[PDB]
RNA sequence: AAGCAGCUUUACAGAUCAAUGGCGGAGGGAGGUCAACAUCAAGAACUGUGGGCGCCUAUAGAACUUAUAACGAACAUGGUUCUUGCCUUUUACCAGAACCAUCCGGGUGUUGUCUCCAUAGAAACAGGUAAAGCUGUCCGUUACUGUGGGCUUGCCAUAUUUUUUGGAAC
């Protein structure tokens, strides 16, 4: 997962929402910190800009690689 | 890690708790499990009244049930 | 490998051999190592002794840089009636605090004041042993595994055979303070310089003390 | 716009841009204001934090990089470098981290260690809500550190102590490990002994074990968090840290207050920390670098470079310590755990000015502490208590010399307050100033344009409403830990350079706050510094740096304070309205208590120590000393109408004694009689009250058989055992120089002898002490006690033998002091007695008959 | 394990937006953050999932109920992430 | 100041009838005396009687070992 | 801190045996009381003169630092001007000041030589500066496996409220 650092991630939480952003760091609990992360629900429609955020490893369901690193 | 409620000590605090429950009471005790001892336990019933459940017999509420608390 | 090579430009030594050279060089090195012991014998202090025309009783006396001509003519200030004569304010104070005690100094270098007092204890006894010259000291997770012993366990003795020699050498002057250094010509080694920079001990023949003063004179010049 | 202006400032490991974003938050800014005695490693520890934060300092050479000559970063002054001390506060703004990687920014201020500079230490206490008192092991807890503990407790400021120079006890002393731990038990024992309401130790994150020359600071919690966090689980590690320090032992997983029959007694600080440390040192200077290298690759996870392996023993040891004890996040952790913003900050800002209710959030209210010259330009060190300060804003300024006047003006409640614009704002970085657009709450900043309004300390505020002007509280003038009695009269050698010199003196009053500059009407200038070295720094800074003039300098002098011995035998009416005032000395404890409402006042006075309900009830006022009123004719409210005026004329009477026109000290004035004529005109009434008050108090002392009072430097000396007698001989060389207690410092040859020497007798007494002791002794002169003793001899002695060019005999001393002070102030013009003070003639005949 | 918590620690004094499990969002300056993710805010404005908005002074919400917390972008470059 | 475990212990000494609200269930509220509890705060209740909120009737439940995780609100009645 | 797995390598058997990708290499390393040649405190905003792209590399021209203690933990000798006694002239001078200079020496950096220690090679080709794999091509292992080393890593211990042993389902 450390190999997965800085990659843009599309993550899906237990509430069904999708959060997109570069993973800045994680932990054992899988608490993620996302750069310039944006929220989206229905799909692009109903999208919002969170920015720098930290999502908890308990409510997270799964995450996938989105785009290239920088 | 012991949570610091010291700034809420002996103050009237309004808990919100799982199941759209709302409590109001003066803080007494707490612990690392965050379980709370309240005085003057006050339920907020669904609409108009606020039921006063406990006066001098205080109360204790398990921690994880707490959504949050306000001063 | 202890030296740069046949050109013999650089040298690097181990601890024990340098300690040997030190214990051999004790007669020629008087162990003046304390810097605070030099008070008013700093080169700064002698320069200020020259610019102020004030001779430390141990230091050399010089020609004054500025010929003494008095323009005071006793104004209201520093009159005999105004000032209070109590403390002798002898020359040593003038070289001690150049600006405060002295009026109109020129080209005066600020002295070093002092380092903290030197508590150094030289052994004459195991390493890290309590000196009888010291003042006595008045006094007034319970489980853990079987493992976890304090750091550097199995290292046996705390004091190695050389560590005393290490500590005694740690405070050595510029020559012996180091395990490596450049080569200096025998022309460039001053052995007798560290002898006249010291306070002359009492009960020397007056001629010897005068020799100290002359040597210091050439040195400061 | 200022991007092209900097280019000098060194790049910092953390970006400087984020630091100000951290500065926007009042919670994240802690002001350290590090304190400590002389040569305690303060500037060197601050240097460790600066080198720690920045990348590569341009002003450090290869030699100071090896660590031979200790780098002092925070002293950029020519004199501070050459003379080797610290003088003016120069701190740093350092974003720092705890054991938790949370990064709190800190404003450090290094107060000079030498005692004559304690003014800067007072500015540091008033500046900093935290205090790191850096204590030397070998010097133990000195009396100066005691004064810093009691002093910081007085103004309510948190303290986090740093025990420093362990490598001295380890190398110089070569203490056995158990005995050295006993030394630490002695240091901390005295520490908690002089701290009344707190318990400091390595646990609780208060004491910080450090050696600056070899560049490492660590706390037991930081250390365990480093090298014991691998073996110990996270569950028991906290309690394990809490139990490390004392009165416990260890074998295998077993803890007892007793050694439990084991062959070795190692009370768990020795064994777990202090022994690994000793083995680090002894192996570092001693052990072969190969197997040592193997230890560091094994135990501490340290990898040595070949260049590192090739270092000399001292630089190699410094480098090994910087690898074992990593970049310093522990000391900052102890800073955080030490300082709690609540229960303190409000108490602090209430102690500095007035107890009040919060502050209006809109208005900007900030204390102006010290005027510093930095790049050769006038700056102002300002701490913002509330509101935000923008570059280019117009702000009101008031020198704290006028404060209580304004506060009384509000208690009776355009503006007389001169306003100035902020030209620039900066964050002190030590050798560089980092400019910032706007300054925020709870931080220490510099401003260029403020320096012109105020003499030394000021209040700086901008209000958005007038109700705020009603609700503003202003800062009391800074209380300097030590009063400055050291007196030197100056004149320029070329009088035509006098005007420029005047400007210089003004700048001096701004740059050195504790200096008290007096301008005598005879043209001879007077300067009052704390002591010898402080006034010397004043002179070198005054001439070379600011105004370059040949300056004649009189022998060092003192301020004398007139007083009375017995009770005034006669009550003399005084007219140009006839007032007779009786005088009497204060009680012993009444003085000490004074230097440091009416019902509570009479209860504290009477209760605490002897008084009568009429006297203690009728006390009108206290100053600097206390005016009292005890006729039977007090019945009319007249004395209540003129009471304020009597307290005024009493102020002018006490500010100038009858003898030397010097401040009256320890004298209670009780009013026996006040006459009022038939006709009353308030202007001529009061304007004739003032002179009769001044003359009244003069007659008060002179009828009491007045005595002079000389100040007394309290003397702290560190000598060795064999050189103790010589010092005692020096004490017999001076009229003063009482020795009281000779304190044995544990585990060191140094005996610290306390003493008292009068400031007249002491001139370069430090220097003579050192030359007599051959550099093995050290002397310090500290007068914060405001203790005054009578110079032996009786003033008003017509026949006393005074040698013109030689010191005078003991019994004749006070006489020549009075004479020569009167002449230096031009009062003589040629025993004041009562004649010019109007004993009149016939009554003067009557007193001559008695 | 350091960065996620230690970040939320360094978020004190910064305006943050909590979204909770029930969906009610609490914005405001973060007064305190305990290592267990229990957080305490002052000057909090709350938005219910239905859109209802209120303003409140002192709030303290447990960790276990936090859906996530958004901290200002200033921390993007911080000494935390430097290895 | 009184810790919640010793407060629950105080209710244990007092023995007064205790009303308990469960977790994420608003329909039932159980009543009865506390005969003991553990460090996990799993409480064995005496004379347990249901109190449906959905006029309040109930079925006597006897003694019960009640798991602390469902335990939410402990009071007296 | 053992083992397992992952990562990096590695003596390697290897897939490919192509296009690749990585790391190194396209001119060695020590030494010499061996030479010659340049300089000799580090700064540097700011500008100028050039390159590389308002920024770095190279130079000098002022600001504003201390050289400092010490190109050298040493320290000589002259010259010029000023002053002091010899003095009264040339020397030679005693003692200082200021500014120059001579000598004794040293670090570097560039090359050239002159002796020990080495084994792949792709150390092959073409471009230029004041410099070099500096650039382009290029080749050595090789980019995906299993045995062998090291860690920068997780387990070797957590099912009891704040995370992973769910309060969901409908
Ligand atoms: N032997 C030894 N000397 C030390 C140690 N730490 C500091 N010193 C010396 O103590 C001196 C004083 O420290 P500084 O920081 O330079 O100055 P200071 O302590 O602030 O003293 P002031 O500047 O006058 O306030 C330093 O110059 C060091 O030479 C140490 O650990 N061991």
Q: Residue positions of D in the annotated binding site? A: 36-43, 110-114, 164-167
For residue E61, the cross-strand partners are B68, E39
How far, in Å, CA of E48 to CA of E19, rounded? 10
How far, in Å, CA of D789 to CA of D561, rounded? 10
Rounded to a whole number, what is the distance in Å from the CA of A45 to chain E's nearest CA? Answer: 18
Spatial neighbors of C59 by CB under 8 A, at least 6 apart, are C40, C41, C45, C46, C49, C213, C216, C220
How far, in Å, CA of D178 to CA of D186, rounded? 12
3-class state of residue C12 by DSSP: strand
Q: Among residues D828, D811, D577, D600, which one has the least CA distance to residue D695?
A: D577
For residue A21, the cross-strand partners are A9
Verify whether ligand 1 is closer than 6 Å to residue D88 (CB atom): no
How far, in Å, CA of D487 to CA of D495, rounded? 21
Verify whether ligand 1 is closer than 6 Å to residue D43 (CB atom): yes
Residue nearest to atom 27 of ligand 1 (CA): D70
- Paired sense of beta strands D389-390 and D381-386, if any: unpaired
Pick the residue of A21, A54, A61 with the most E CBs within 10 A to test the interface with E by mutation.
A54
Contact D70, D164 (CB under 8 A): no
3-class state of residue B20 by DSSP: coil
How far, in Å, CA of E18 to CA of D179, rounded? 55
Task: List gaps in chain F by the residue before each (C–N > 2.5 Å).
Answer: 54
For F40, which DSSP code? T
Tokens representing D516? 């008290």
Residue A67 Cα distances to A12, A16, A48, A51, F14, angstroms:
16, 21, 19, 17, 64
Q: Among residues D658, D662, D653, which one has the least CA distance to residue D704?
A: D658
Residue of chain A whose Cα is closest to the Cα of E16: A53
- Paired sense of beta strands D738-744 and D751-758, if any: antiparallel
Residue nearest to nucleotide G104 (CA to C1'): C187
Contact D551, C104 (CB under 8 A): yes
Spatial neighbors of D357 by CB under 8 A, at least 6 apart, are D471
Backbone angles phi, psi at F3, to 5 degrees: -65, 150
Domains of chain F: 1-76 (2.30.30.100)
Spatial neighbors of D696 by CB under 8 A, at least 6 apart, are D574, D579, D580, D581, D649, D653
Ordered by start, the domain boundaries in chain B are 1-71
A70 part of a folded domain = no
How far, in Å, CA of D598 to CA of D252, rounded? 67
Q: Print the SS3 string covering C148-200.
A: CCCCCCCCCCCCCCCHHHHHHHHCCCCCCCCCEEECCCHHHCCCCHHHHCCCC
Residue D651 Cα distances to D54, D310, D327, D466, D654, angstroms:
54, 71, 57, 33, 5
- Paired sense of beta strands F18-22 and A60-65, if any: unpaired
How far, in Å, CA of D162 to CA of C71, rounded? 54
The number of beta carbons lying within 10 Å of the beta carbon of residue D598 is 11
Backbone angles phi, psi at D661, to 5 degrees: 55, 55
How far, in Å, CA of D454 to CA of D472, rounded? 18
For D835, which DSSP code? T
Whether residue D26 lies within 8 A of chain C, CB to CB, comes out as no
How far, in Å, CA of D431 to CA of D433, rounded? 7
Contact D760, C84 (CB under 8 A): yes
Backbone angles phi, psi at C139, to 5 degrees: -135, 165
For residue D642, the cross-strand partners are none
Domain with A32 in it: 1-65
Whether residue E5 and residue A31 make contact (CB cut-off 8 A), yes or no, is yes
Give the DSSP per-residue string, D163-180: EE-HHHIIIII---HHHH
In this structure, CATH architecture of domain D483-559 = 2-Layer Sandwich (3.30)
Residue C46 Cα distances to C215, C217, D537, angstroms:
13, 9, 20
Rounded to a whole number, what is the distance in Å from the CA of E10 to chain A's nearest CA? Answer: 13
Q: Among residues D140, D726, D265, D146, which one has the least CA distance to residue C134?
A: D140
How far, in Å, CA of E32 to CA of E19, rounded? 17
At E6, which CATH number?
2.30.30.100
Q: Given the structure tokens 């907020």, which residue do they identify?
A: B44
Contact D192, D233 (CB under 8 A): no
Residues of chain C contacting residue D494, judged by C-beta atoms under 8 Å apart: none
How far, in Å, CA of A62 to CA of B13, rounded? 37
The number of beta carbons lying within 10 Å of the beta carbon of residue F54 is 6
* D805 burial level (CB within 10 Å; 0-12, 13-18, 19+): exposed
How far, in Å, CA of D675 to CA of D689, rounded? 11
Domain with E63 in it: 2-80
* D828 burial level (CB within 10 Å; 0-12, 13-18, 19+): middle
Contact D677, D577 (CB under 8 A): yes
How far, in Å, CA of D528 to CA of D338, rounded? 37
At A14, which CATH number?
2.30.30.100
Q: Among residues B63, B55, B52, which one has the least CA distance to residue B15?
A: B63
Spatial neighbors of A31 by CB under 8 A, at least 6 apart, are A54, A55, A56, A57, E4, E5
Helices and strands per DSSP (H, E), number in chain C: 7, 2
How far, in Å, CA of D660 to CA of D827, rounded? 8
* Burial annotation E65-83 (CB, 10 A radius, 16+ → b, else e): bbbbbbbeeebeebbbeee
How far, in Å, CA of C178 to CA of D229, rounded? 37
- Paired sense of beta strands D709-719 and D778-782, if any: antiparallel
Number of folded domains in chain A?
1
Contact D320, D304 (CB under 8 A): yes
Whether residue A56 and residue E67 make contact (CB cut-off 8 A), yes or no, is yes
Q: Among residues D785, D791, D251, D756, which one has the least CA distance to residue D481?
A: D785
How far, in Å, CA of F31 to CA of F77, rounded? 8
For C38, which DSSP code? G
How far, in Å, CA of B51 to CA of D437, rounded? 55
Residue D208 Cα distances to C12, D132, D135, D161, angstroms:
37, 9, 10, 6
- Ligand 1 atom index nearest CA of D134: 19
* D661 burial level (CB within 10 Å; 0-12, 13-18, 19+): middle
How far, in Å, CA of E25 to CA of E43, rounded? 13
A31 part of a folded domain = yes
Spatial neighbors of C74 by CB under 8 A, at least 6 apart, are none
How far, in Å, CA of E70 to CA of A21, rounded? 13
CA of D370 to C1' of G70 (A): 38
Angular region, A3: left φ>0, alpha ψ -120 to 50, beta rest: alpha
Spatial neighbors of D490 by CB under 8 A, at least 6 apart, are D501, D524, D525, D526, D527, D551, D552, D553, D554
How far, in Å, CA of D190 to CA of D743, rounded? 13
Give the DSSP per-residue string, C111-152: ----PPPP--------TT---TTSPP---------S----TT
The number of beta carbons lying within 10 Å of the beta carbon of residue D677 is 12
Contact B18, B65 (CB under 8 A): yes
Spatial neighbors of D667 by CB under 8 A, at least 6 apart, are D563, D564, D583, D584, D585, D586, D625, D700, D701, D704
Spatial neighbors of E51 by CB under 8 A, at least 6 apart, are none
Number of folded domains in chain E?
1
How far, in Å, CA of D198 to CA of D175, rounded? 29
Contact D153, D182 (CB under 8 A): no
Q: Among residues E62, C72, C140, C98, which one has the least CA distance to residue D540?
A: C98
For residue D162, the cross-strand partners are D134, D208
CA of C218 to C1' of G78 (A): 18
* C80 burial level (CB within 10 Å; 0-12, 13-18, 19+): exposed
Verify whether ligand 1 is closer than 6 Å to residue D44 (CB atom): yes
Give the DSSP per-residue string, E2-49: HHHHHHHHHTTTSEEEEEESS--EEEEEEEEE-TTS-EEEEEEEEE-T
Method of determination is: cryo-EM
Tokens representing C199? 């306070």
Spatial neighbors of D607 by CB under 8 A, at least 6 apart, are none
3-class state of residue A40 by DSSP: strand
Numbered ranges of CATH 3.30.70.870 in chain D = 483-559
Angle, vertex CA F48, rays to CA F42 and CA F49, nearest 5: 135
* A30 burial level (CB within 10 Å; 0-12, 13-18, 19+): middle
Nearest 10 degrees: CA dihedral of D403, D409, D413, D417?
-70
Q: Measured between CB atoms, which of C83, C136, C147 is closest to D555?
A: C83
Q: Among residues D146, D145, D151, which one has the least CA distance to residue D164?
A: D145
Backbone angles phi, psi at C155, to 5 degrees: -80, 0
3-class state of residue D496 by DSSP: helix
How far, in Å, CA of D102 to CA of D100, rounded? 5
Chain mean position to CA C122: 15
Verify whether ligand 1 is closer than 6 Å to residue D336 (CB atom): no
Q: How would you list the strands of the sheet with D619-622, edge to edge?
A: D579-585, D667-674, D626-629, D619-622
For D663, which DSSP code? -
Q: Which nucleotides of G are covered by protein (CB under 7 A)?
A: 1, 30-33, 42-46, 54-55, 63-70, 72-76, 83, 95-97, 104-107, 152-153, 160-164, 167-168
Sign, CA torsion D67/D70/D72/D76: negative
Pick the residue of E2, E4, E81 with the most A CBs within 10 A to test the interface with A by mutation.
E4
Residues of chain E contacting residue A26, judged by C-beta atoms under 8 Å apart: 3-4
- For D719-724, the CB contacts below 8 A with 24+ separation are D719/D750, D719/D751, D719/D752, D719/D753, D719/D773, D719/D776, D719/D777, D719/D778, D720/D749, D720/D750, D720/D751, D720/D776, D720/D777, D721/C133, D721/D749, D721/D751, D723/D773, D723/D774, D723/D776, D723/D777, D724/D751, D724/D753
Contact E36, B1 (CB under 8 A): yes
Contact D491, D552 (CB under 8 A): yes
Length of chain C: 221
Length of chain E: 83
Q: Among 3.50.30.60, 1.20.120.160, 2.30.30.100, 3.40.50.970, what is the CATH number of B1-71? A: 2.30.30.100
């Amino acid at each position: 997962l450390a190999n997965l650092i800085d990659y843009k991630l599309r993550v899906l939480t237990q509430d069904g929402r999708v959060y997109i952003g570069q993973l800045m760091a994680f932990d054992k609990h899988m608490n993620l910190v996302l750069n310039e992360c944006i929220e989206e629900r229905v799909p692009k429609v109903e999208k919002r800009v969170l920015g720098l955020t930290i999502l908890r490893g308990e409510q997270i369901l799964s995450t996938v690689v989105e785009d290239k690193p920088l | 890690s012991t949570p610091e409620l010291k700034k809420y000590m002996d103050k009237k605090i309004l808990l919100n708790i799982n199941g759209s429950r709302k409590v109001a009471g003066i803080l007494r005790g707490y612990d690392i499990f965050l379980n709370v001892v309240l005085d003057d336990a006050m339920e907020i019933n669904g609409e108009d009244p606020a039921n006063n459940h406990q006066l001098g017999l205080q109360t204790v509420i398990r921690g994880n049930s707490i959504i949050s608390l306000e001063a | 490998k202890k030296v740069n090579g046949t050109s013999y430009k650089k040298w690097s030594f181990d601890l024990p051999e340098m300690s040997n050279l030190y214990r051999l060089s004790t007669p020629l090195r008087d162990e003046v190592t304390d810097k605070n012991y030099y008070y008013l014998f700093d080169k700064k202090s002698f320069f200020n002794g020259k610019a102020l025309n004030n001779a430390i009783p141990g230091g050399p006396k010089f020609e004054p840089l500025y010929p003494r001509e008095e323009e005071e003519d006793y104004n209201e200030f520093n009159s005999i009636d105004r000032v209070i004569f109590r403390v002798p304010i002898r020359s040593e104070y003038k070289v001690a605090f150049p600006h405060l005690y002295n009026s109109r100094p020129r080209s005066v270098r600020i002295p070093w004041y002092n380092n903290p007092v030197s508590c150094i204890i030289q052994n004459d006894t195991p390493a890290l042993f309590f000196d009888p010259s010291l003042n006595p000291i008045p006094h007034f997770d319970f489980t853990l595994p079987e493992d976890f012993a304090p750091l550097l366990a199995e290292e046996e003795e705390l004091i190695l055979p050389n560590t005393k020699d290490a500590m005694s050498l740690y405070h050595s002057p510029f020559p012996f303070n180091r395990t490596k250094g450049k080569m200096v010509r025998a022309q460039d080694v001053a052995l007798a310089k560290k002898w006249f920079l010291q306070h002359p001990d009492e009960e020397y023949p007056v001629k010897v003390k005068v020799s100290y003063q002359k040597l210091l004179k050439n040195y400061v010049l | 716009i200022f991007t092209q202006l900097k280019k000098n400032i060194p790049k910092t490991r953390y970006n400087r841009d984020y630091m100000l974003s951290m500065a926007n938050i009042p919670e994240r800014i802690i002001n350290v204001g590090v304190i400590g005695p002389l040569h305690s490693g303060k500037t060197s520890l601050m240097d460790l934090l600066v080198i720690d934060s920045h990348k590569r300092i341009p002003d450090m050479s290869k030699n100071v990089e090896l660590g031979w000559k200790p780098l002092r970063y925070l002293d950029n002054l020519k004199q501070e470098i050459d003379r080797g001390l610290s003088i003016k506060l120069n701190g740093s703004t350092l974003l720092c981290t705890d054991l938790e990687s949370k990064s709190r920014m800190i404003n450090f201020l290094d107060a000079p260690g030498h005692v004559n500079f304690m003014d800067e230490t007072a500015v540091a206490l008033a500046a900093s809500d935290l205090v790191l008192i850096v204590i030397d092991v070998v010097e133990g807890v000195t009396f100066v550190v005691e004064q810093l503990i009691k002093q910081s407790i007085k103004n309510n400021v948190a303290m986090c102590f740093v025990i420093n120079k362990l490598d001295r006890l380890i190398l110089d002393l070569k203490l056995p490990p158990m005995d050295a731990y006993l030394k630490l038990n002695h240091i901390i024992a005295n520490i908690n002994s002089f701290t009344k309401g707190n318990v400091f130790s390595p646990i609780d994150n208060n004491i910080i074990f450090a050696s600056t020359k070899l560049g490492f600071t660590f706390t037991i919690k930081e250390f365990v968090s480093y090298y014991y966090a691998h073996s110990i689980p996270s569950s028991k590690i906290d309690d394990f840290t809490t139990r490390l320090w004392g009165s416990v032992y260890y074998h295998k997983g077993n803890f007892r207050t007793k050694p439990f029959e084991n062959v070795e007694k190692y009370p768990t600080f020795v064994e777990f920390i202090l022994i690994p440390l000793y083995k680090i040192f002894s192996y570092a200077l001693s052990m072969e670098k190969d197997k040592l290298k193997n230890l560091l690759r094994s135990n501490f996870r340290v990898n040595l470079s070949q260049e590192a392996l090739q270092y000399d023993p001292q630089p190699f040891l410094k480098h090994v310590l910087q690898l074992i004890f990593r970049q310093q996040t522990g000391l900052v952790d102890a800073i955080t755990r030490c300082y709690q913003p609540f229960e303190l900050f409000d108490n602090k800002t209430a102690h500095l000015s007035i107890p009040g209710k919060s502050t209006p959030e809109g208005t900007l209210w900030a204390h102006v502490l010290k005027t510093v010259d930095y790049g050769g330009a006038e700056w102002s060190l300002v701490r913002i208590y509330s509101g935000l300060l923008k570059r280019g804003d117009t702000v009101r300024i008031l020198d704290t010399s006028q404060s209580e006047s304004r506060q009384k003006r509000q208690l009776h409640d355009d503006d007389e307050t001169p306003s100035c614009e902020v030209e620039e704002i900066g964050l002190l970085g030590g050798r560089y100033v980092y400019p910032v657009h706007e300054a925020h709450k709870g931080q220490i900043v510099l401003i260029k344009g403020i320096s012109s309004a105020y003499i030394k300390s000021a209040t700086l505020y901008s209000v958005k409403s007038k109700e705020d002007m009603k609700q503003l509280k202003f800062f009391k003038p800074l209380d300097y830990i030590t009063e400055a009695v050291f007196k030197i009269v100056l004149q320029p050698l070329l009088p035509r350079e006098l005007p420029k010199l005047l400007d210089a003196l003004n700048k001096i009053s701004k740059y050195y706050p504790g200096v008290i500059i007096k301008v005598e009407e005879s043209g001879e200038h007077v300067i009052l510094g704390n002591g010898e070295l402080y006034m010397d720094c004043l002179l070198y800074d005054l001439r070379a740096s600011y105004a370059k003039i040949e300056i004649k300098i009189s022998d060092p002098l003192t301020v004398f304070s007139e007083s009375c011995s017995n009770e005034s035998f006669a009550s003399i009416p005084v007219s140009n309205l006839s007032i007779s005032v009786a005088a009497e000395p204060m009680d012993s404890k009444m003085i000490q208590d004074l230097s440091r409402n009416p019902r509570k006042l009479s209860k504290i006075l009477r209760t605490e120590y002897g008084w009568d309900s009429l006297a203690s009830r009728n006390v009108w006022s206290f100053y600097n000393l206390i005016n009292d009123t005890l006729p039977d004719e007090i019945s009319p409210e007249l004395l209540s109408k003129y009471k304020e005026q009597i307290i005024q004329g009493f102020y002018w009477a006490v500010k100038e004694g009858p003898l030397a026109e010097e401040p009256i000290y320890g004298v209670q004035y009780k009013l026996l009689s006040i006459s009022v004529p038939s006709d009353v005109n308030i202007d001529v009434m009061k304007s004739q009250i003032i002179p009769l008050m001044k003359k009244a108090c003069y007659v008060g002392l002179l009828t009491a058989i007045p005595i002079l009072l000389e100040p007394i430097y309290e003397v702290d000396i560190t000598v060795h055992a064999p050189l103790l007698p010589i010092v005692e001989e020096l004490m017999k060389k001076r009229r003063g120089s009482r020795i009281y207690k000779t304190i044995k410092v544990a585990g060191t040859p140094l005996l610290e002898v306390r003493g008292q020497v009068p400031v007249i007798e002491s001139a370069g007494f430090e220097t003579d002490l050192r030359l007599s002791t051959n550099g093995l002794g050290m002397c310090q002169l500290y007068f914060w006690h405001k203790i005054w003793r009578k110079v032996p001899g009786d003033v008003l002695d017509k026949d006393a033998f005074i040698p013109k060019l030689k010191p005078a005999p003991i019994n004749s001393l006070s006489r020549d002091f009075v004479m020569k002070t009167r002449r230096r102030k031009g009062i003589s013009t040629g025993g004041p007695t009562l004649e010019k003070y109007i004993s009149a003639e016939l009554y003067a005949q009557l007193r001559e008959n008695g | 394990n350091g960065i996620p918590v230690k970040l939320l620690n360094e978020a004190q004094g910064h305006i943050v937006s909590l979204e909770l499990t029930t969906g009610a969002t609490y914005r405001g300056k973060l007064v305190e953050s305990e290592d267990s993710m229990n957080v305490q805010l002052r000057d909090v404005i709350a938005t219910e999932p239905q859109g209802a908005v209120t303003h409140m002074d002192q709030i303290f919400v447990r960790g276990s109920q936090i859906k996530f917390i958004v901290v200002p972008d200033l921390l993007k470059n911080a000494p935390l992430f430097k290895k | 100041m009184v810790p919640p475990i010793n407060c629950i212990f105080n209710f244990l000494q007092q023995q007064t009838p205790v009303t308990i609200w469960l977790f994420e269930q608003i329909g039932i509220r159980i009543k009865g005396k506390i005969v003991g509890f553990d460090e996990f705060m799993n409480v064995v209740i005496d004379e347990a009687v249901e109190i449906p909120v959905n006029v309040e009737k109930g079925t006597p439940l006897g003694k019960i070992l009640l798991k602390g995780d469902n335990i939410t609100l402990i009071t007296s009645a």
